Amino acid sequence: APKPGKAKKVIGVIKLALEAGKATPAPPVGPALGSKGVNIMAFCKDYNARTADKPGFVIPVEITVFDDKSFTFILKTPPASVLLLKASGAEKGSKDPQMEKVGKITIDQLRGIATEKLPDLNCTTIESAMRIIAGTAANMGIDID
Amino acid sequence: KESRIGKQPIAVPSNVTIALEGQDLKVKGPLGELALTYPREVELTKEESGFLRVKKTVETRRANQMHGLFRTLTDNMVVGVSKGFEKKLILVGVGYRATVDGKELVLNLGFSHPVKMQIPDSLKVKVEENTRITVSGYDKSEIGQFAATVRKWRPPEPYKGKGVKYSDEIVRRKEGKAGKKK
Amino acid sequence: MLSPKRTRFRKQHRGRMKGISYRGNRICFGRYALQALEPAWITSRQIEAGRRAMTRNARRGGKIWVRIFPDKPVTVRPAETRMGSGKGSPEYWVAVVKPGRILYEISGVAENIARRAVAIAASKMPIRTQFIISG
Amino acid sequence: MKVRSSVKKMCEFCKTVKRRGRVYVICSSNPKHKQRQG
RNA sequence: GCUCAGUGAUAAAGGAGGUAGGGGUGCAGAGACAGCCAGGAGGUUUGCCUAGAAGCAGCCACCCUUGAAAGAGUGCGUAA
């Protein structure tokens, strides 16, 4: 494993898909990690604060509770799907992969997405990362130049 | 899948001495002495090297049924009269407890009357806690069979698992509630 | 041993399954195949329940071929005595499935997927079936 | 245990052992797989 | 020489390594198989649909990366 990171896992962690600046509503985040331990009142302020550096998309949040009332979380990179939708300028993917295409992306696009979304992909070289996300567009109906 | 036959060389330390005469090998040790009768058509001798030897008449598929059988009835007695065997029994549920009263053991598993279990020969029973029921024995058939009778009363129900269960027995707790739609 | 036919003046005698002489085909279409051992009166409700089952475990794949065709009609007596010959269409129609002849054929797929496919198809057949391959 | 004529194994957790001329199939996974005759 | 069924002194489709004989094939001390110990990862929480379904209702897709090994993947399970 040339890419360190293999540590302890499975410790009662919850993962959601909230949007940068969206966590105040009760119905949404409410039922989510509400009976775990973390207070619904908190997190929200500490969420839209760190995600304020780029409000406009969804950022993978990792919530991990403890034996106390406190809590900790880490900000990750957006899905390799939503990114291909932004570069292609489309709302949703296609209904039939390959059969129907919704948009197309250049090599520079797939390359830029692999870089921005690198500190989350388990790879070694750059030519790989790009090819890793390339297979994602081939599922939502998005051919590459 | 499954491989081929394989003998398990189990003899000496001389903590167990064998003495065969006629289709009846005798097993001794620091604990006690066991005896088992074996059918004919087979021979057995005590090698000078220090290993329980056993041979067969022919290489027929039926011979393996015998040779591969007596092979164990000669080793289970060895470790049985040396290392010994002790089974731990644990109970679950309120009101369930184990208490000894001499040579007999009494239990209370829902039954209106306290059931009693007698202790046979070549077998010993001890109860450290009202939840633990250990029973030391020499051989395996006795100590084992005596474990089925003490669990024959009321086994662990697939809802809460109460009554009598072997040590580290995964009864696999199953949800009793039904009708729910995933 | 039947397939979709067309309207016509069909209404003749019964017939009689003779020796294996006639039937004795081989494996032309498809990789593997399936033959019979003893002649019989295979109805349409059997071939249809066997064909759909052949592709029931596949769904969208290769193609099914039928190198057979029914002929010998089937007349049955209602419940009365015997005044004349039967109708010929009360229940259905059949033919003759003598041994040596080929029935179902599968190809364009793997060996395993084409093996279990014939299995269920054989269950639909009232007469015992023999599994083959090629050569 | 369901009688039936054709027992046949159910899941990979089936050993299908013949006992007293009667082929049985004990499954430690789901008792529903436990069949008698076959 | 086989059956050890009392089958032979009724009875099918089908099911089961109960069992004898003959031939051949795959893996195999660059050490296979059963068992024991450990790993079984990341994007993809994938697309579509759905109140929700993140291997595991269903439809389509089912490629790629890091490696000794690990399929967007079998069975159980959760409202998810």
Curated annotation (Swiss-Prot), chain A:
N6,N6,N6-trimethyllysine found at: 9, 45
Lineage: Eukaryota, Viridiplantae, Streptophyta, Embryophyta, Tracheophyta
UniProt GO molecular function: large ribosomal subunit rRNA binding; structural constituent of ribosome
Full-sequence range covered: 67 to 211 of 224
Record-stated family: Belongs to the universal ribosomal protein uL11 family.
Recorded name of the encoding gene: rpl11
Subunit structure of this chain's protein: Component of the chloroplast large ribosomal subunit (LSU). Mature 70S chloroplast ribosomes of higher plants consist of a small (30S) and a large (50S) subunit. The 30S small subunit contains 1 molecule of ribosomal RNA (16S rRNA) and 24 different proteins. The 50S large subunit contains 3 rRNA molecules (23S, 5S and 4.5S rRNA) and 33 different proteins.
Biological processes annotated in GO: translation
Entry protein name: Large ribosomal subunit protein uL11c
Physiological role: Component of the chloroplast ribosome (chloro-ribosome), a dedicated translation machinery responsible for the synthesis of chloroplast genome-encoded proteins, including proteins of the transcription and translation machinery and components of the photosynthetic apparatus.
Transmembrane segments: none
Signal peptide: none
Residue ranges the record marks as coiled coil: none
GO cellular component: chloroplast; cytosolic large ribosomal subunit
Domain of life: Eukaryota
Keywords, alphabetical: Chloroplast, Methylation, Plastid, Ribonucleoprotein, Ribosomal protein, RNA-binding, rRNA-binding, Transit peptide
Primary localisation category: plastid
Subcellular localization, as worded in the UniProt entry: Plastid, Chloroplast
Swiss-Prot record, chain C:
PROSITE patterns the UniProt entry points to: RIBOSOMAL_L16_1 (PS00586), RIBOSOMAL_L16_2 (PS00701)
BP-aspect Gene Ontology terms: mitochondrial translation
Localization annotation: Plastid, Chloroplast
Pfam family of the protein (one): Ribosomal_L16
Entry GO CC: chloroplast; mitochondrial large ribosomal subunit
Keywords assigned: Chloroplast, Methylation, Plastid, Ribonucleoprotein, Ribosomal protein
Modifications made to the protein after synthesis: Partially alpha-N-monomethylated at Met-1 (10%), whereas 90% of it is blocked to Edman degradation, probably by trimethylation.
Modified residues (N-methylmethionine): 1
Alphabetized HAMAP family for the sequence: Ribosomal_uL16
Subunit structure: Component of the chloroplast large ribosomal subunit (LSU). Mature 70S chloroplast ribosomes of higher plants consist of a small (30S) and a large (50S) subunit. The 30S small subunit contains 1 molecule of ribosomal RNA (16S rRNA) and 24 different proteins. The 50S large subunit contains 3 rRNA molecules (23S, 5S and 4.5S rRNA) and 33 different proteins.
Homology family: Belongs to the universal ribosomal protein uL16 family.
Protein name: Large ribosomal subunit protein uL16c
Source organism of this protein record: Spinacia oleracea
